Paper text:
In previous work we have explored the potential for establishing a bump-&-hole system targeting the bromodomains of the [name] (bromo and extra-terminal) protein family. These four human proteins – [name], BRD3, BRD4 and BRDT – each contain two tandem bromodomains that bind acetylated lysine residues in histone tails, leading to the recruitment of multi-protein complexes to chromatin. Through this function the [name] proteins play a significant role in controlling transcription and regulating gene expression. The phenotypes generated by said inhibitors have been used to investigate the functions of [name] proteins and their significance as therapeutic targets. This process has been limited by the pan-selective nature of the [name] inhibitors, as they typically target all [name] bromodomains with similar potency, hence specific proteins/bromodomains cannot be associated to specific phenotypes. Through structural analysis of the bromodomain we hypothesized that a leucine/valine substitution (L/V) would be a more conservative change than the previous L/A substitution, resulting in a smaller ‘hole’ but still allowing enough space to accommodate a bumped ligand.
Author numbering: 343 to 455
Write the structure that this text describes.
Amino acid sequence: MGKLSEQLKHCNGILKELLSKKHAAYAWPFYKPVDASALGVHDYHDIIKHPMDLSTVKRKMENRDYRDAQEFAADVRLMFSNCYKYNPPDHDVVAMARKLQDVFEFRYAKMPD
Ligand SMILES: C[C@H](O)COCC(CO)(COC[C@@H](C)O)COC[C@@H](C)O
Ligand SMILES: C[C@H](O)COC[C@H](C)O
Ligand SMILES: [Cl-]
Protein backbone atom coordinates (compact mmCIF):
# COMPACT_ATOMS: atom_id res chain seq x y z
CA MET A 1 0.00 0.00 0.00
CA GLY A 2 3.05 2.22 0.43
CA LYS A 3 4.40 4.09 3.44
CA LEU A 4 2.28 6.99 4.69
CA SER A 5 3.88 10.40 4.34
CA GLU A 6 5.19 11.97 7.54
CA GLN A 7 2.09 14.15 7.80
CA LEU A 8 -0.21 11.18 7.27
CA LYS A 9 1.70 9.21 9.95
CA HIS A 10 0.82 12.04 12.34
CA CYS A 11 -2.81 11.84 11.16
CA ASN A 12 -2.83 8.10 11.72
CA GLY A 13 -1.48 8.68 15.22
CA ILE A 14 -4.27 11.14 15.96
CA LEU A 15 -6.82 8.65 14.63
CA LYS A 16 -5.47 5.88 16.86
CA GLU A 17 -5.68 8.26 19.80
CA LEU A 18 -9.30 9.18 19.00
CA LEU A 19 -10.15 5.46 19.02
CA SER A 20 -8.21 4.72 22.22
CA LYS A 21 -9.63 3.84 25.62
CA LYS A 22 -8.67 7.12 27.28
CA HIS A 23 -11.16 9.06 25.11
CA ALA A 24 -13.87 6.39 24.94
CA ALA A 25 -16.23 8.16 27.34
CA TYR A 26 -16.91 10.86 24.74
CA ALA A 27 -15.65 9.19 21.53
CA TRP A 28 -17.91 6.14 21.42
CA PRO A 29 -20.82 7.70 19.49
CA PHE A 30 -18.36 8.39 16.63
CA TYR A 31 -16.89 4.88 16.37
CA LYS A 32 -19.22 3.47 13.70
CA PRO A 33 -21.64 4.77 11.05
CA VAL A 34 -24.93 6.07 12.44
CA ASP A 35 -27.53 3.31 12.06
CA ALA A 36 -30.53 5.52 11.45
CA SER A 37 -33.17 2.80 11.58
CA ALA A 38 -31.72 1.30 14.77
CA LEU A 39 -31.89 4.68 16.52
CA GLY A 40 -35.24 5.65 15.02
CA VAL A 41 -33.76 8.79 13.46
CA HIS A 42 -35.78 8.44 10.28
CA ASP A 43 -34.84 11.93 9.08
CA TYR A 44 -31.08 11.45 9.50
CA HIS A 45 -30.27 10.77 5.85
CA ASP A 46 -32.48 13.62 4.70
CA ILE A 47 -30.48 16.02 6.85
CA ILE A 48 -27.00 14.47 6.63
CA LYS A 49 -26.00 14.05 3.00
CA HIS A 50 -22.44 12.88 3.72
CA PRO A 51 -22.21 10.59 6.75
CA MET A 52 -18.80 10.08 8.32
CA ASP A 53 -17.44 8.25 11.37
CA LEU A 54 -14.10 7.08 12.76
CA SER A 55 -14.29 3.51 11.42
CA THR A 56 -14.75 4.93 7.92
CA VAL A 57 -11.80 7.29 8.41
CA LYS A 58 -9.75 4.30 9.59
CA ARG A 59 -10.66 2.19 6.56
CA LYS A 60 -9.82 5.10 4.27
CA MET A 61 -6.42 5.53 5.94
CA GLU A 62 -5.67 1.80 5.68
CA ASN A 63 -6.69 1.84 2.02
CA ARG A 64 -4.52 4.92 1.32
CA ASP A 65 -7.59 6.83 0.19
CA TYR A 66 -6.33 10.05 1.83
CA ARG A 67 -3.71 11.70 -0.31
CA ASP A 68 -2.79 14.30 2.29
CA ALA A 69 -3.47 15.52 5.83
CA GLN A 70 -5.98 18.13 4.67
CA GLU A 71 -8.19 15.43 3.15
CA PHE A 72 -8.07 13.45 6.39
CA ALA A 73 -8.89 16.51 8.51
CA ALA A 74 -11.83 17.44 6.28
CA ASP A 75 -13.40 14.01 6.95
CA VAL A 76 -12.87 14.18 10.71
CA ARG A 77 -14.38 17.67 10.74
CA LEU A 78 -17.28 16.51 8.53
CA MET A 79 -18.05 13.87 11.16
CA PHE A 80 -18.25 16.54 13.88
CA SER A 81 -20.23 18.92 11.65
CA ASN A 82 -22.84 16.25 10.97
CA CYS A 83 -23.31 15.90 14.72
CA TYR A 84 -23.67 19.68 15.15
CA LYS A 85 -26.11 19.81 12.24
CA TYR A 86 -28.40 16.96 13.24
CA ASN A 87 -28.57 17.39 17.02
CA PRO A 88 -29.81 20.34 19.09
CA PRO A 89 -26.89 22.30 20.59
CA ASP A 90 -27.71 21.27 24.18
CA HIS A 91 -27.67 17.52 23.39
CA ASP A 92 -25.29 15.33 25.40
CA VAL A 93 -23.77 14.03 22.16
CA VAL A 94 -22.92 17.55 21.04
CA ALA A 95 -20.93 18.07 24.25
CA MET A 96 -19.14 14.78 23.50
CA ALA A 97 -18.36 15.92 19.95
CA ARG A 98 -16.94 19.22 21.20
CA LYS A 99 -14.64 17.38 23.62
CA LEU A 100 -13.39 14.94 20.99
CA GLN A 101 -12.94 17.78 18.51
CA ASP A 102 -10.79 19.59 21.08
CA VAL A 103 -8.57 16.50 21.29
CA PHE A 104 -8.45 16.37 17.49
CA GLU A 105 -7.79 20.04 16.74
CA PHE A 106 -5.07 20.50 19.34
CA ARG A 107 -3.10 17.48 18.14
CA TYR A 108 -3.73 18.19 14.45
CA ALA A 109 -2.23 21.63 15.09
CA LYS A 110 1.03 19.89 16.13
CA MET A 111 1.43 18.52 12.59
CA PRO A 112 5.05 18.35 11.43
CA ASP A 113 5.79 20.75 8.56
C1 LIG B 1 -25.05 10.37 25.81
C2 LIG B 1 -25.89 9.77 24.68
O1 LIG B 1 -27.09 10.48 24.56
C3 LIG B 1 -25.14 9.84 23.36
O2 LIG B 1 -26.02 9.43 22.30
C4 LIG B 1 -25.34 9.15 21.09
C5 LIG B 1 -26.34 8.75 20.02
C6 LIG B 1 -27.14 7.46 20.45
O3 LIG B 1 -26.22 6.39 20.65
C7 LIG B 1 -25.49 8.46 18.68
O4 LIG B 1 -24.87 9.68 18.31
C8 LIG B 1 -24.07 9.57 17.10
C9 LIG B 1 -23.51 10.92 16.77
C10 LIG B 1 -22.48 10.76 15.65
O5 LIG B 1 -24.55 11.75 16.34
C11 LIG B 1 -27.33 9.89 19.75
O6 LIG B 1 -28.18 9.52 18.69
C12 LIG B 1 -29.00 10.57 18.17
C13 LIG B 1 -28.37 11.23 16.91
C14 LIG B 1 -27.99 10.19 15.86
O7 LIG B 1 -27.24 11.93 17.26
C1 LIG C 1 -16.89 22.90 19.77
C2 LIG C 1 -16.60 23.36 18.36
O1 LIG C 1 -17.57 22.84 17.48
C3 LIG C 1 -15.23 22.86 17.97
O2 LIG C 1 -14.26 23.55 18.74
C4 LIG C 1 -12.96 23.01 18.62
C5 LIG C 1 -12.02 23.75 19.55
C6 LIG C 1 -10.61 23.30 19.31
O3 LIG C 1 -12.37 23.46 20.89
CL1 LIG D 1 -11.25 21.40 6.65
